[PDB]
Paper text:
αHBs are oligomers of 5 or more α-helical peptides that assemble into coiled-coil structures with central solvent-accessible channels. We targeted two properties of αHBs: oligomeric state, which directly affects the internal diameter of the channel; and the identities of channel-facing residues, which fine tune this dimension and introduce different chemistries. The αHBs are loaded with an environment sensitive dye (in this case, 1,6-diphenyl-1,3,5-hexatriene, DPH) that binds within the channels and fluoresces. Accordingly, challenging the array with analytes leads to differential displacement of the dye across the array to give a fluorescent fingerprint.
Despite the requirements for aliphatic residues at a and d, up to 40% of these can be changed to other side chains without compromising barrel integrity. We introduced mutations at one or two of these sites to generate four groups of αHB: Group I had entirely hydrophobic interiors, but with different sizes and shapes of channel; Groups II and III had polar uncharged or polar charged residues, respectively, at specific points along the channel; and Group IV had aromatic residues installed in their channels. In detail, the sixteen Group I peptides included: previous designs for a pentamer, 3 hexamers, 2 heptamers and an octamer all verified by X-ray crystallography;27,29 single and/or double mutations to Ala and Gly at central a and d sites to generate larger channels; a single-Pro mutant at the final d site to kink and open the C-terminal end of the channel; and a variant with all a sites made Met to vary the hydrophobic chemistry used. Finally, one third of the designs were crystallized and yielded 12 X-ray crystal structures, all of which were open αHBs with fully accessible channels. Conversely, the FAs generate signal through interactions with the more-hydrophobic and aromatic-containing channels (Group I and IV).
Numbering used by the authors:
A (entry chain F), B (entry chain C), C (entry chain G), D (entry chain E), E (entry chain A), F (entry chain B), ...: 1 to 30
Write the structure that this text describes.
């Protein structure tokens, strides 16, 4: 449905944004 | 469909933000 | 209504943020 | 009500974040 | 209630993020 | 309940993101 | 349920994004 599917897509995108931010943090850590 | 339409646009926008953050992470990773 | 109006304004903002993140990613892409 | 007021504040902040992100994209655009 | 409190805290935090993004945009403008 | 817990965790995280983004803005401010 | 599981995944991702943003803020301060 309209609400459940939109929430599942938000969750998948948020997990990918977290993975990318962790890579950027690791590049800038010494 | 004001709530359904907002949630669909938020979900698509978050998928595009996730693609872009993965590209930036890939540019910055060793 | 104030909740439908806020959801609509959040969706339009998220679309603008996605456009901006794509421009930045394109600038940084090798 | 507090839930309606919180949503309206989140919408106003998201609009400001969209404006800033477009300025940053304009500075890095080629 | 815990849900109304969570939404109030989300709103205050997004207002602070919008302030910080405007500062970063002013630094990079030009 | 798990939905109330999720909202509390999202609020705590948004406060930490807002704190971090103000430190980044301070570093970038002349 | 899919909506409860999406909310739990959004909270875990937001907590990881908060950790990453504080590591980046640490890199950028004395």
């Amino acid at each position: 449905g309209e609400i459940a599917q939109a929430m599942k897509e938000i969750a998948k995108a948020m997990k990918e944004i977290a993975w990318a931010m962790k890579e950027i943090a690791q590049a800038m850590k010494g």
